[PDB]
A paper describes a structure:
Addressing the elusive specificity of cysteine cathepsins, which in contrast to caspases and trypsin-like proteases lack strict specificity determining P1 pocket, calls for innovative approaches. Hence, we set out to determine the crystal structures of cathepsin complexes with representative peptides of cleaved substrates. As a working model, [name] was chosen because of the resolution of diffracting crystals (up to 1.3 Å) and crystal packing with accessible active site cleft. Reactive site mutants [name] and C25S of [name] were used in structural studies.
The pattern II group (binding shifted to the non-primed side) consisted of structures of nine protected peptides and one non-protected peptide that all bound uncleaved into the non-primed sites. Electron density maps of the peptides enabled the unambiguous interpretation of residues from P3–P1. The nitrogen of the amide protection group at the peptide C-terminus was bound approximately 3 Å away from the ND of catalytic H164. At P4 and beyond, the features of the electron density maps became weaker and less precise; however, it was possible to model the peptides KPKKKTK, RLSAKP, GNYKEAKK, and EVCKKKK up to P8 in the averaged kick Fo-Fc omit maps. MPD molecules were bound to the primed sites of all structures. Three sequences [name], EVCKKKK, and IILKEK were among examples of [name] single protein cleavages, but they were cleaved two or three times in the peptidyl form. Peptides from patterns I and IV bound to [name] consistent with the observed protein cleavage sites, whereas the peptides from patterns II and III did not bind according to their cleavage site found in proteins. Similarly, the binding of C-terminal carbonyl from amide of peptides of group II, as well as the binding of carboxylic terminus from the cleaved peptides of groups I and IV, can be explained.
Numbering used by the authors: 1 to 221
The structure:
Amino acid sequence: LPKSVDWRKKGYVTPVKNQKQCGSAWAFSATGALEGQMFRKTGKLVSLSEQNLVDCSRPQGNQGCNGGFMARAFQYVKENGGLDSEESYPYVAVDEICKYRPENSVAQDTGFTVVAPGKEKALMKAVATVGPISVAMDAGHSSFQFYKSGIYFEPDCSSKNLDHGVLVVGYGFEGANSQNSKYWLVKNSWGPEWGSNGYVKIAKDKNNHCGIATAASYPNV
Ligand SMILES: [Cl-]
Ligand SMILES: [Cl-]
């Protein structure tokens, strides 16, 4: 596998969005993964609707602004036959009436693939071969809230009890040795002002830190 990967440098990733006061990170992680897979398929980067997921995927088990899971979102897109664009179905950060319109759909998936649970090397392989990957993580720490630079490492992090969905857009390392001071490149949904332009470097090959490889998946387009 490559020593480092960053799909942002290849055009697969939209600018950082902001879920605001709605527990919809699962939806942003899902649209993020879908955006990259659709780009791989068509060469066009089109921002996708998190509000369409929030409003319409309760049947698949999501709970709108009160939480959800990326796999259930990819399941909804499959069963639904489509997903609208961000422009056509804008984000308002509150649970609303499902207004899915097929004519505005710009994405589809046939289901999703799960990364072997808990294996950072499996996640490394998925990231290098597929594109950005949706992952769950333990983000319940002030250290994460006020993260700004460096490789994030939090001793109180859990690899099993997760509360936030994010997007792995690559991986890398500091220095000249590709085999140490490694990190996962993670896109968050708390706006570009949070973290490092909306991103965070999370310690990689440090025992599945914060659960990054516990529940990773990607849509099949
Ligand atoms: Cl999930
Ligand atoms: Cl940057």
